[PDB]
Each structure stands twice: as C-alpha cells, then as structure tokens.
C-alpha cells in the first residue's frame, strides 16, 4: 500500500532489508543442512536421491547429496558451494563443512536479532578461525620412519 508512486524506479522487484532478512537467511541455511545431518560417522545412513526422470543414485557423500538438492534460495546455496571447494582441497570434507557452517550461524542467531553490528561479528569470526587452525598445526603428529614398512602401515 505504501510504495505506490505513479512511476516506479525499476520495474517490479522484491526487496527486503535488515534483521528479518538475516533471520530468514540463517533459517534457510539450517534447512539445507538437514540433508547430511544423518550421514556422519561409521554408523550413519545412506540416502536415495531420485531425479525428475526416475533415475536414482544411492550414496552418503556430500559431494553427491548436496549437488542434487536443487536449492534456489540465494543464501542457502552457500552451504553447497563450500562442499565443492572441500571436494577439491580435502577430498572428503563434505558433509562436515556444511553442518559446521550451519552451526556457526545458529550459535549467534539469538544475538544477531538484538543490535550487534555486523562488523564485530566478522571480527570475532576471523579471530576464532585463525586461532583454531594454528592450534591444529601445533598438535598434529608426524613420523620419522619414512621409506620403511612403518610408512606403508601409516597409509593403511
């Protein structure tokens, strides 16, 4: 009723702004994460995904599950693209990166609705991220038994 001038600026677009736009973006990310929630661990389950032709694929790898969801939400797509990158850089970092990213948003969801300028959210995300990856390097273990049966057993 309100934005009803005689001539519009553009054509017929939809436009949202502010806190309700972030809340919806976080919620959509929580929904798309559901596809892989039950695929973690040696005791996880497999999925059967059927396309519009009736052709089915059975798997539990996020490299297959997340590519067949046909997500159209502008923001939820992010939790699929990060699996494409992990598939190239790690090779099996699939289901875990989608779930972790969704949880990062959930933990801050109750706070982003009440002020909390986005700049400080980014600062905190970057600070914690750099700390976490530094600690991993300090605790990972290596071997000094290269070119021996011990290295072949390590690969097994």
């Amino acid at each position: 009723m309100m934005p009803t001038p005689v001539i519009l600026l553009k054509e017929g677009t939809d436009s949202s702004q502010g806190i309700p736009q972030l809340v919806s973006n976080i919620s959509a990310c929580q929904v798309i994460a559901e596809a892989v929630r039950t695929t973690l661990g040696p005791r996880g389950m497999d999925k059967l995904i059927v396309d519009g032709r009736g052709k089915a694929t059975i798997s539990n790898d996020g490299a297959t599950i997340l590519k067949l969801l046909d997500v159209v939400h502008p923001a939820a797509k992010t939790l699929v693209d990060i699996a494409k990158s992990q598939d190239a850089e790690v090779g099996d970092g699939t289901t875990s990166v989608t779930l972790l990213a969704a949880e990062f948003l959930k933990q801050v969801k109750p706070y982003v609705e009440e002020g909390l300028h986005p700049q400080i959210i980014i600062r905190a995300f970057r600070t914690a991220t750099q700390l976490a990856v530094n600690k991993i390097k300090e605790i990972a273990v290596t071997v000094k038994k290269a070119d021996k049966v011990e290295q072949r057993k390590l690969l097994e």
Binding site: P5, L9, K10
Partner: protein
Amino acid sequence: HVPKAPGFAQMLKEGAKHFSGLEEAVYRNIQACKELAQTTRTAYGPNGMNKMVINHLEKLFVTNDAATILRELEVQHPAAKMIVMASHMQEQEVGDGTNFVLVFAGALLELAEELLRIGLSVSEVIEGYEIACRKAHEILPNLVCCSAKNLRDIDEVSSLLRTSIMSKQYGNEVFLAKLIAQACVSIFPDSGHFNVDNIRVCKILGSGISSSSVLHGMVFKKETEGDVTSVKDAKIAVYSCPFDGMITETKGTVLIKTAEELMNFSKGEENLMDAQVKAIADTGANVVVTGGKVADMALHYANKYNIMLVRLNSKWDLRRLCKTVGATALPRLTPPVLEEMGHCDSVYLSEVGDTQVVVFKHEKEDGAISTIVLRGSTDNLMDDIERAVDDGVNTFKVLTRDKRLVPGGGATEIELAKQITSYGETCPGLEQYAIKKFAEAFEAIPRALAENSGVKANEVISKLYAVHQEGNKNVGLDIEAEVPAVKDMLEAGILDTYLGKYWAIKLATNAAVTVLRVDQIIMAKPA
C-alpha cells in the same frame, strides 16, 4: 446518474502520459532520484553492507560496489538514469569514488526541493549551485597535505592503495595491499604511462584468500596433448596458422589419371608434412603455440621432434602472450623462425584447484604482464576480490596522473562545507541561500558514514565541526570503534583520490542540474 468530465484540449494521443509543472514534473523527478540514492546508501562506506542481487538472467551477484550493482539493476525511471550515467563517467575517469555521485547529486536535488517550495525557481538555484561549485574548486587545491612523490617503491605503494581496498574489502586491507604492491611495481613503465591492462586476475576455486599469490607471467587453462610438458629452455614460436599444412582458399580438387598418382599421392603428403614440422625443429624451438586445430599427423611429428604444443582459442589471450614472451604471431605456415622467437625462464603444466593449467613463467624478464591468482571457497568471494584488485590497479594510475592527496575520512568534505558557507554569508543577494545549501550537500556525506557505523550521526557531525575551529583542518571521522572520538586523518593515514573528488563534484553537479532543468515530460505509450 453521475456524469463524467469530457476531454479538455489535447486528447489526441493513443494512451500516452504527460506531465508538466513544478509538482507533476520537477518534484516527481527529484522523488525518483531520492529512491535511487537510498537504494545504494546502505552499502556506503567501509562499514557498509552487501547486497544480493538476482538479475534478469537468474544469476546471483553479491557485492557492495555500486558501480557494479547499478549496471545489474534495471532502472527505468528517466530521472534516475541521469545520475546513474554520471556514476559511469566517474568509473571511466578515475575508477573509484562512484558512490560520491549518487550521494552528492541526491543531496543537491533534495536540498533544491527545500528551496523550490519556499522561494526561487530552478532558474536561480542552478546558478547558485554553479557559483558555489566554482568556489569549491578553488578550495580543493588549498587542502592538499601530502604527495605521492617520495619512496616510489613497493613499500610506499603498499600503504597508498590501502584506502581503496579497505573501502570494499575491510578485513583484507593488509593481505591484498601486499599482493597489489607486488603487481603495480612489476610493470613500472620506466616513468611513462602506467598500463592498467598489464595486470590480470586468475580465479581458481580452492582454499581461502591467504593462498593467493602473484605470478610473473600468464596462466592458461588448456592442455598440451603430449608428454613434453616440462620445458626449461622455453624457446617459443607463436603462429596463427592451423597446424595441419596448407589448404586452398576456394575449392580445390585432385585429378588422377594413372595408378601411380593415386598410390603415391597420400605418401607424398606425409613427406611434405614432415618437412613442414622440421622447418621449425631445426631452429631449436621448444614450444609451438597456435589458436587453430592440430592434425593427427602434426601430433605424430610433434612427438618425433619433441615439440610442445599449446592451443589458445582466444585471439586476445594469444596476443597478450606474444607481448609476454617477446614473439610475433606469424599468419603463415611455420618457417624456420629465427629472429621472432620468444623466451621464458620456465614453462610447465600443473594441476591447481583440479584444473590443468599451462604456466609461462618469467624470472629475469619479469615486467611484461603480471597475473594475480586468487583462491576462495566460493565463486562469489573471488568475483568480489577481483573487483577489489581492479581498484588497486586503477588507483595507482590515478596517483600517477595527479600525485596530490587531500585528507580523507570526511575531512575534505567538512572543510568544503565550512568554507563554502562562509563565502555565501558574504554574498549581498539571494544567492546566499543556494550557496549555503550547496555546502550542506557535503555535510550529508560524513553523516552517511556515521549512520552505517552504528554511531549517532547528530553528535558525530557536531564533533567534526567542533574540532575545526580555524586551527586544525585535518581531523576526520573514526569509524573503527564505538564513540568515534574523532582523530587526525594524516596520522591515521586516511587520504586518497584527490583527482577523484575534483571530477566527482563536477559529474554530481551536472547530474543535479540536468534533472532540475526538466519542467515538462512527454511520454510515449508504454509497451
């Protein structure tokens, strides 16, 4: 029952619209321009927010750079287009500061409305804006505090370009500043023209930004079709001819009259192809680059003479390589090229981001072309960083064109608003009202920076004026922390785009004047 009003005088259109007068034409043009300025206001400043825009092709583009948002949004109102076009000229002129055009031009039109509703028509408001504008260009040369003259090396440029990076890529203002510094110095034009087209960006999906680097040369995403992918001498021949021998230009037909001619025809052709490939092998060439196709016999002989092949289908990519390696592309079949051969230091293929790429690396003759290789977890991030790289490349050119810098952070705008107002106060006429309003158009700019920073703009702007009591002229707006507690911009290191501010005022003023000069609008029938 109830009658209807008849036609009046000019009911000869086929459904067209028509507007005239202060309320129906002038104010409506201004109102549309307000919506434009408001649309981009949210993204303004280093603390601005991103937009997610889905265009008419169902593609998703995410950024905060208005120069690339406006070209995707299908603005139709004829008044808003006038400001959008000015913002494109700002991009063409200096490549940065485009936000200025929508913020300042919008403020001029909004403030013009305040005058039109109480007093003088556009016939004097426009003239008053020009009087004040001309004075602004006499103030600007007197606000210069620094110059990009000293320490013209990699260390100083890594500091000069940061103001252009942090304005869009806040958290990467250091990492990206180091990468672009390594590129801007690499093509130093021996104190000549800085060719902004000699720095490219290569986007490869993978890990985050920290893995990005600069490569002194070119990277392609094609294959070799052979087992000689590692070349150390890299004596390079470039051709535009297809690698399959000579063909006719009209038709051509083979006439055979005896069995010997039939039997020996094919074998003769293979012998000729051997000589055609040998012609360049005898010169010591290592790599043959073409844009055309390669025959099966060409691959047979390429393996005979251990020749590396690269196919680059894009004519512009091959021309860039020619200038990189120091070679000429020959349109004719491969002669024993001696004097037009190029040289690299290392040519190799690698698998980077699950993409097989061809690298032409230079270590000695580095400054021909540089490629900045970007990594990231999403295509959306890499596209946005690439735009940030462009700003650093263009900003360097702007700094070469005019080495003077004026304090940033709103300090220049506050000084313009103050000094311009003082001039208007001494004008013994009615023009003082439009001159003062021209000054207020500048005040709107640091207000926008405060609004997006989470701080109360009314108190922030009071402080920005309070600290300029004739003896400072350098304190600006601190947007890094709550309660800005305004600080010196020269100690902060915030100052840039002097030339940009010069032309941005001219383009923004002309857009506002053009809108104000429209009193009557005649529309065609919509379709």
